[PDB]
Every structure is written in structure tokens, then in C-alpha cells.
């Protein structure tokens, strides 16, 4: 059974925030467990469509690419995540899951029937509008979550050839680049104490992915305010070698951690940096897979994000 029937895609999301402190850096295991169960269908859907996308990308397997599209079509037709959203954890999940669905569609779209195109693209544009509208409230502070919202908007923009979505995504990307301080920090992520390095990593990942998707349109977003992203990315790689700087600047000893999943933006960025060897140690921690970024980052950095039809 190489393409199982798609799982139910509920219009509703009810996630549960799980941090115990004001800096959102210490995890409540009971709330984390509660949230894991509540968003299991969202995480599993993303994992599956990205796995199907990765299999399509190997070639000689159009059926896997077609499986991703049937799954996306099912969630499109049930209005998944377009219904009701201790914090805005449900919105964060809609942002991340939109990103995963939109990346999967971007990678497999050549195989789509016209029926799947109408279904999926209407749904991706409604998710883009809903997720963008979340950020209309100035009380929603534009940290890495805002950059992650750009992933789904950008993938939707490229796949639907929508110039206005493309401009919306470019605004989000440039806002992230413009927030990098002269020393490379992002103050909203530096406020996360023992998770400061973690969230400089997690903020870099969607900015890099958006710049890489921009190449699919023949644009080089890496030239925008050139040098700023390099400072941020270099801080992340230096931080994994030696957290001393993040310890000093954040006021807290960093949580022991190795690069994983979304840290795979380094598979793309090491091909762009003026000092690529700085990313050797992160590269050596791979390969990297993240459904929220479209699947296997190590392979996509080598083969291109979108397989050739």
C-alpha cells in the first residue's frame, strides 16, 4: 500500500503552550506532552507529505509525488486548519503546517491534476491570508514565528506564480534581515536565555529557505543588505562550536544541543557564504531532514528544491 488513504484534516487546531518562564525557555513536561498529542495529526501529515516529496525527488517514482498531492488535496477539500485557532500556539502550528504543505506542493506540483491545482492552491492562498492576518495585531511580536510564516507564503507564491504573495514573502524576509544587529544578534531571540542560540538557529532557517526559494524565480535575495545574514549565520555556527558569546549576550548558559532538522539551512547557506568552512562542523552533524522546510535539506541543497518534471 504505497499511497494510503489520507488522514482526516480538521478545520480546527487546539495546541497548548508549554513554557514555564517569561523568556519561554524552560519546558513544562506535562504541557509538552499535552501539546504533542494535540498536534500529532498536524506533525504526522507534514512528515508524510515531505517523505512522499523526498521519494518523488529520487526519480522514477511519480506515484510518490502523486501521493503527496492526493494528501494535500484531501486537506484542502476539508478546509483543514481554516477554522478555530495559554498562548498563540495554535497559530504557530498553522504557520508551520502551512509551510510544510506549501513546500510539498511546491516540490510535487508538476504532477498535479487541474482538479488538485484548484483545490490545493485555493487552500494554500487562504492559509497565506489567515496566517498573514495574525500578524496584523501589533501585540503579536515578530520573532522567528514571523519569519516562519514567510515559508508557507513564499512556497505558495512561487507555486501559484502570485506576485503579490511573492512581495508579501519578500517583505517578511527583509524584515528578518533588517532586524539583525551589527553584531549579528536578533534581539527577540537573544531574549530567550538558555535557548538563545537555539532560536538564532531557528530564525535563520526560514530566512535561508525563503532566499533559496527566491532563486526558483530568478532572484537573488541574498544580495539584500548583504553581510547581515552572514553575521547571523556565522554566530549560529560559532555558537554550536562554543556557546560563550551567547552565554555572555543572553545572560544564561546555553542548553547543550547539537544541530538537527531545521539546522539544515546550513546545507544551502554553506554554498553562499564568503567563509563556507565555518559551517563544516554543522554540516558534519547531518544529513538534515525537516518537513517544515520541505523534507531532506541535505539532498535539496545538492539537487535543487524542485525536481525537474
> CA 105 to CA 60: how far, in whole Å?
18
In the chain, where are the structural domains located? 29-303
Residues paired with residue 19 on neighbouring β-strands, in sequence order:
27
- Cβ distance 277 to 270 under 8 Å? no
Establish how many alpha carbons lie within 13 A of residue 240's alpha carbon, considering only the half-sphere containing its beta carbon.
24
Dihedral pair phi/psi, residue 289, rounded to 5°: -135, 135
Closest CA to 237 of 192, 283, 274: 283
Query: Can you state the angle between helices 163-179 and 228-241, rounded to 10 degrees?
Result: 60
Dihedral pair phi/psi, residue 9, rounded to 5°: -110, 95
Structure determination method:
X-ray
Q: Determine whether 304 is exposed, middle or buried from the number of CB atoms within 10 Å of its CB (0-12, 13-18, 19+).
A: middle
Residues in the chain: 309
List % helix, strand, coil for the chain (3-state, nearest 5).
65, 0, 35
Instruction: Look at the alpha carbons of 180, 181, 182, 183 in this order and tell me if their dihedral is positive or negative.
Output: negative
- Cβ distance 292 to 46 under 8 Å? yes
> CA 191 to CA 210: how far, in whole Å?
24
b/e per residue, 163-192, with b = 16+ CB within 10 A?
eebbebbbebbbebbebbeeebbbebbbbb
H/E stretch holding 249 reads helix 244-250
- Cβ distance 193 to 252 under 8 Å? yes
Amino acid at each position: 500500500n504505497d499511497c494510503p488513504a489520507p488522514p482526516p484534516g480538521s478545520p480546527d487546531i487546539r495546541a497548548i503552550g508549554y513554557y514555564t518562564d517569561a523568556a519561554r525557555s524552560v519546558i513544562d513536561p506535562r504541557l509538552k506532552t499535552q501539546n504533542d498529542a494535540a498536534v500529532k495529526p498536524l506533525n504526522a501529515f507534514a512528515a508524510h507529505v515531505a517523505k512522499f516529496a523526498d521519494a518523488y525527488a529520487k526519480g522514477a517514482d511519480e506515484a510518490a509525488g502523486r501521493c503527496a498531492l492526493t494528501w494535500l488535496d484531501a486537506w484542502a477539500r476539508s478546509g483543514a486548519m481554516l477554522g478555530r485557532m495559554n498562548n498563540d500556539q495554535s497559530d504557530y502550528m498553522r504557520q508551520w503546517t502551512h509551510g510544510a504543505a506549501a513546500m510539498a506542493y511546491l516540490r510535487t506540483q508538476a504532477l498535479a491534476s487541474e482538479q488538485q491545482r484548484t483545490d490545493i492552491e485555493t487552500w494554500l492562498k487562504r492559509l497565506s491570508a489567515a496566517n498573514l492576518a495574525y500578524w496584523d495585531n501589533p501585540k503579536h511580536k515578530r520573532n522567528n514565528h514571523y519569519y516562519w510564516t514567510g515559508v508557507g507564503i513564499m512556497a505558495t507564491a512561487v507555486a501559484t506564480r502570485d506576485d503579490t504573495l511573492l512581495n508579501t514573502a519578500q517583505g517578511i524576509y527583509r524584515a528578518g534581515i533588517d532586524a539583525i544587529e551589527p553584531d549579528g544578534r536578533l534581539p527577540m531571540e537573544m531574549a530567550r536565555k538558555r535557548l538563545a542560540l537555539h532560536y538564532h538557529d531557528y530564525a535563520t532557517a526560514p530566512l535561508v529557505l525563503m532566499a533559496e526559494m527566491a532563486r526558483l524565480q530568478g532572484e537573488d535575495w541574498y544580495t539584500y543588505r548583504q553581510g547581515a545574514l552572514e553575521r547571523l549565520a556565522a554566530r549560529v555556527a560559532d555558537g554550536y562550536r562554543d556557546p560563550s558569546w551567547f552565554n555572555t549576550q543572553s545572560g544564561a548558559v546555553q542548553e547543550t544541543a547539537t544541530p538537527k532538522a531545521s539546522s539544515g539551512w546550513v546545507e544551502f547557506y554553506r554554498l553562499r557564504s564568503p567563509d563556507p568552512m565555518r559551517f563544516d562542523a554543522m554540516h558534519a552533524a547531518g544529513p538534515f531532514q525537516d518537513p517544515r522546510m520541505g523534507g531532506n535539506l541535505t539532498l535539496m541543497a545538492q539537487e535543487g528544491i524542485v525536481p525537474l518534471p
